[PDB]
Amino acid sequence: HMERLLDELTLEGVARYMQSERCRRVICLVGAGISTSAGIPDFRSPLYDNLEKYHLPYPEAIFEISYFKKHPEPFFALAKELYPGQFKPTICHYFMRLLKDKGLLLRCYTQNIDTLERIAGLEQEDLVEAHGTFYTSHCVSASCRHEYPLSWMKEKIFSEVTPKCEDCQSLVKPDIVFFGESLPARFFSCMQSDFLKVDLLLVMGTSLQVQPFASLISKAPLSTPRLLINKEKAGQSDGMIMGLGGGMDFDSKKAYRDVAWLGECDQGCLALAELLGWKKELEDLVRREHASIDAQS
Template sequence: MSESGDQTKREEEEPDTPDFEAESDDSSDEGEASGDSEMDFLRNLFSRTLGLSPEEKVLDDLSLEGVARYIQSGKCKNIICMVGAGISTSAGIPDFRSPGTGLYANLQKYNLPYPEAIFQIDYFKKHPEPFFALARELYPGQFKPTVCHYFIRMLKDKGLLRRCYSQNIDTLERVAGLEGEDLIEAHGTFHTSHCVSLFCRKEYTMDWMKEKIFSEDIPKCDACNNLVKPDIVFFGENLPARFFTTMKKDFPHCDLLIIMGTSLQVQPFASLVSRVPNSCPRLLINMEKTGQSEFGMGLLGFGGGMDFDSDKAYRDVAHLSTCDDGCLAFAELLGWKGELEELVKREHALIDSKDSKKKDEKTKQSSETPEKTKVAEPEAGKSEKTE
């Protein structure tokens, strides 16, 4: 990737986990980022509308084939992926908004005032039980990464992935082989947990939280007895500071933005699509077109302003399919399909082997009941000698 040594060194020194302590810096970064996004959007909008600066057309065709040829040309060296819940549905994890099957459509059993309440920080502090019950169902470690996850891993292995920005909290990107420096978990992670008290903020490990969740205990801080919550971002909380600092370095250098499995309805994540250079192609692999903003909404900085269909479209491509099917089709055009299928097969077999080994160890431990040592009773008329 085309970065200076100093910049690469600075990135390597960044923490892999979200900085939940720097709330004041986070808020200022978020405000600054929002302002930058609005100005970028307006600048791009008026320059295109008024014809003040003709855009460079990088793709020879607005299709998946055109994007594949662009990658094969060697001119595309910095790819950023933006992904949402749709890349994990084939693993058995529901997305949020699909009618009937989405997470929000199936929360009646938790007796919530409204579906989103399960991820509202104020509601959680008063009623933590629904969230931890849901966490038992969706907890990381119970699912395998999908074809889409491994396609992103291949981009990394081939030196093309600058970063993956994920809305997901299932950690499947990490299971597939992405490491901390490859990944921005915009909506947080189960990898660490913290006490919710701003005066404590004691950190707990993933293993500690997992034990609490599956024992059906409400996790409480042993220092102050307040609730402990996984470091996933609830409504009413700031995004990790690293999201804002890293996007400022990444997006100006992006050669191709690949958006997969997201409705682009949640801000500020959705606004990232407007932060790439004007000439940067943007590929959407999704079940439906998204990110297209109305003129009025665009002026307010909402929506990505993607243009797939107008006569002024010059860089946006929509491939409508499941994320797995889209990645397989894309990989075939790139000549990577066989390699991708072999990677998925090998990694899934490795996960199955590890799971089988863990189950065997648990079975062995439960069957090996230690024999009780029989204590000899003293003979009649004799007392036990105490040494």
């Protein structure tokens, strides 16, 4: 039987393992659930309605790069409607910032496009924005590719002026991955390397149903522990490679490394930080950084 790095399948067992010498390199996989406490909805059933007024040939047209390029106005009107009114990263995001500053964070793979990871102080090298990001935008012409910052894009969105490139007048598109586009190059380079070197996988606020995350959990070594912090269980499996070839196993007789902590991401992170002796550091970090944002309003 495989080496069992967790002494028990609980948050407590994960924390003891994190403090042990073996655990040096943590990868986080994070989705829309880490940003809902920041006032950014995750598009469960509570988006389709906002679409009707745009008179699309079909609803999925809003996500299609092909359709964007000929009829960009629906997308930019939606982006206005959905633009967050403020950008205060959550307790969960700051938990990741603690991981960075303690030298524990190998990588944050995020499905979010809201930039809160960066606002919380994760740097480009810490991040794989698996679904791209609003943080930058580019002219869509292959020979130009001029880059625009978020301040530029925001103004176009709020002014309701379709963003055109100042060099060539082609459309300028936010660097988010529309259906039709390839995942960022950065995604492919990092993943190979990262996932051999990982000691702990921390999966927060994702149902693990969309790409690329849905593959990623099985790329960790087989002994690497995997903690999910989420409102509901996710990533569970119902071929040749047997133990290599499915998902989370939290509840079977054979479960040996995967743990599900059910509830709000912020609360789960606060609970883990508390076990680790980091609760005051985290609370102090959040207060200071939220204050720093509030002082600029």
